[PDB]
Amino acid sequence: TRKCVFCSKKGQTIDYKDTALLRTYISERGKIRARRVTGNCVQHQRDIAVAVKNAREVALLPFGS
Amino acid sequence: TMTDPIADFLTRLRNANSAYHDEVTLPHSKLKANIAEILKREGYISDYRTEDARVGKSLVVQLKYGPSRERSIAGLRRVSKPGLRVYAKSTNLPRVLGGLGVAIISTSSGLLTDRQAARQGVGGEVLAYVW
RNA sequence: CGCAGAUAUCAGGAGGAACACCGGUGGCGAAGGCGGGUCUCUGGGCAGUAACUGACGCUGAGGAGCGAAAGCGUGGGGAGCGAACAGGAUUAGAUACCCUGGUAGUCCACGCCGUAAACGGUGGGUACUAGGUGUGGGUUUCCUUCCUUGGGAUCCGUGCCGUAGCUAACGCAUUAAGUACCCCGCCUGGGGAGUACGGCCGCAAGGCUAAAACUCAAAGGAAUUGACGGGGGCCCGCACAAGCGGCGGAGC
RNA sequence: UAAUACGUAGGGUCCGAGCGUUGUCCGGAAUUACUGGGCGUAAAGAGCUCGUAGGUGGUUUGUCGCGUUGUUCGUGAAAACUCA
RNA sequence: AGGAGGUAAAAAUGCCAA
Numbered sequence: 001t002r003k004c005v006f007c008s009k010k011g012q013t014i015d016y017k018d019t020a021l022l023r024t025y026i027s028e029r030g031k032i033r034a035r036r037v038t039g040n041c042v043q044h045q046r047d048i049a050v051a052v053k054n055a056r057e058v059a060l061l062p063f064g065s
Numbered sequence: 066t067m068t069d070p071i072a073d074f075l076t077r078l079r080n081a082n083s084a085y086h087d088e089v090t091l092p093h094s095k096l097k098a099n100i101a102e103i104l105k106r107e108g109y110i111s112d113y114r115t116e117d118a119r120v121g122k123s124l125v126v127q128l129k130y131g132p133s134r135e136r137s138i139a140g141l142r143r144v145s146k147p148g149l150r151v152y153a154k155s156t157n158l159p160r161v162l163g164g165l166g167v168a169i170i171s172t173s174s175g176l177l178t179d180r181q182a183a184r185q186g187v188g189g190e191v192l193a194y195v196w
Numbered sequence: 197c198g199c200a201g202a203u204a205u206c207a208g209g210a211g212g213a214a215c216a217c218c219g220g221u222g223g224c225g226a227a228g229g230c231g232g233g234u235c236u237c238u239g240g241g242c243a244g245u246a247a248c249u250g251a252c253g254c255u256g257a258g259g260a261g262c263g264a265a266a267g268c269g270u271g272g273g274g275a276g277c278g279a280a281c282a283g284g285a286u287u288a289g290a291u292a293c294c295c296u297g298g299u300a301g302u303c304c305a306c307g308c309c310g311u312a313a314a315c316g317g318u319g320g321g322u323a324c325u326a327g328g329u330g331u332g333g334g335u336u337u338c339c340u341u342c343c344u345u346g347g348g349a350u351c352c353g354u355g356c357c358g359u360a361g362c363u364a365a366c367g368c369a370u371u372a373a374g375u376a377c378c379c380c381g382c383c384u385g386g387g388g389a390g391u392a393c394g395g396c397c398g399c400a401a402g403g404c405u406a407a408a409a410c411u412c413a414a415a416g417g418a419a420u421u422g423a424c425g426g427g428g429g430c431c432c433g434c435a436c437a438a439g440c441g442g443c444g445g446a447g448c
Numbered sequence: 449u450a451a452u453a454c455g456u457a458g459g460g461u462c463c464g465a466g467c468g469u470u471g472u473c474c475g476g477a478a479u480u481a482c483u484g485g486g487c488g489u490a491a492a493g494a495g496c497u498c499g500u501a502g503g504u505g506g507u508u509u510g511u512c513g514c515g516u517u518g519u520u521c522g523u524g525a526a527a528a529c530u531c532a
Numbered sequence: 533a534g535g536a537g538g539u540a541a542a543a544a545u546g547c548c549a550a
């Protein structure tokens with residue numbers, strides 16, 4: 001079990017402008033990574049997913065690159 | 066909700082006696098205190114004591130266990146419950162295990178053992194059976 | 197279906213429906229049920245403080261509301277799928293399974309119907325009865341770096357394993373099918389039958405309430421020992437496979 | 449075609465001025481379970497809530513004596529039932 | 533110890549005692 005990075009006090013604030021922050025959590029195929037592989041908590045994973053979907057909508061991330 | 070505090074007393078006692086606990090803590094009422102007095106007098110419980118809690122008094126009863134781990138109480142059953150209430154005449158006083166147990170009856174003179182009520186000639190509502 | 201230029205590949209356009217990865221034995225909801233994104237309106241729950249009211253609680257006959265899918269009415273829309281319906285194929289026969297098409301329907305708006313293996317096959321409320329290990333939401337003491345699923349305590353939710361106890365058995369076991377109290381619904385052998393008649397509701401399909409005659413000496417639940425399987429696993433035998441020689445044809 | 453189950457015999461058992469059959473009720477039947485049953489799979493939890501009447505009710509002080517309990521009087525005809 | 537892929541044309545019936 002590895003620690004959820006956002007739950008740490010140093011944890012960066014989650015938002016969909018940050019491109020590299022989400023890049024760390026989307027695979028090379030353009031898909032969202034899983035909780036078991038990433039390690040973040042349920043709430044932070046949900047925030048990640050919504051942010052990635054929004055960034056995909058505003059064309060800052062590709063659909064299935 | 067809590068509709069029968071006396072049956073709650075009896076089932077707490079029964080469960081603790083079946084689980085071999087030594088002490089039992091209840092919310093306190095005068096009727097429960099009198100029932101514990103009768104149980105102590107008839108030798109079913111060792112001793113009982115009232116103690117003060119945040120919201121009121123509390124009944125703590127110590128259970129009696131035989132030297133060979135035998136229990137001092139074989140059964141514990143209520144009789145006159147809300148809904149069906151049981152009243153008994155002086156000439157119809159219930160007997161438990163052919164008189165080897167005790168039936169606690171509420172009378173105008175107070176809580177009495179069935180032997181006491183038959184001796185005094187009064188009758189009333191039968192609360193519970195102990196054996 | 198193509199050779200009248202198909203399938204394939206590239207570019208552009210039209211339209212409908214469902215929302216990959218996140219996404220699970222995880223969340224919310226009373227139950228049906230609910231996951232593309234954003235905004236607006238809106239319901240419930242949980243934790244801590246305990247400032248307020250001071251038993252105002254529980255259940256609930258009839259009743260009222262909600263209630264998957266299919267189905268119905270009116271008006272839209274209709275890509276994919278697809279009852280019915282057509283051919284093809286299989287077969288003794290295929291009104292089936294398989295293939296190629298394909299209407300209602302599935303979608304939207306506003307209304308009907310009111311049934312499901314609508315299931316945890318487990319009505320609601322309350323108190324008590326050994327524990328162990330996951331996970332979801334929130335509070336807090338101690339190691340404390342005070343980074344940390346560090347570890348503990350407490351409340352609420354959801355799984356697994358497990359004593360006592362219960363059960364016919366399987367199993368349930370603090371989320372009880374355990375020990376108890378209150379209120380409600382229901383059962384009284386299998387068919388006939390959730391059917392007939394009567395009544396209420398419905399546009400209809402139908403739903404709800406609900407018998408009797410006659411007939412049977414059983415219908416059932418759980419578990420055991422065999423047998424069987426066009427169930428699985430491991431093995432053999434001139435069983436197959438690789439070969440040699442026949443029988444089935446002729447006369448006796 | 450080798451019946452203690454049919455018919456007849458012997459023998460036996462039970463009753464006896466009776467002995468059997470039918471009809472009807474109660475029992476056995478805890479099989480309508482008040483005493484004294486149940487609903488996961490045997491029959492049986494309404495698909496789920498809200499709420500009317502009803503049922504049910506936490507801790508404690510005082511009062512009433514309706515329920516409850518004790519005693520006494522009247523009544524509960526006779527016959528019936530039970531004891532002498 | 534963990535784990536992936538592949539794997540069936542058609543095949544009906546059999547009387548009621550011991």
Ligand SMILES: [Mg+2]
Nearest residue numbers: 043044046047
């Ligand atoms: Mg969030």
Ligand SMILES: [Zn+2]
Nearest residue numbers: 004007041044
């Ligand atoms: Zn986190």
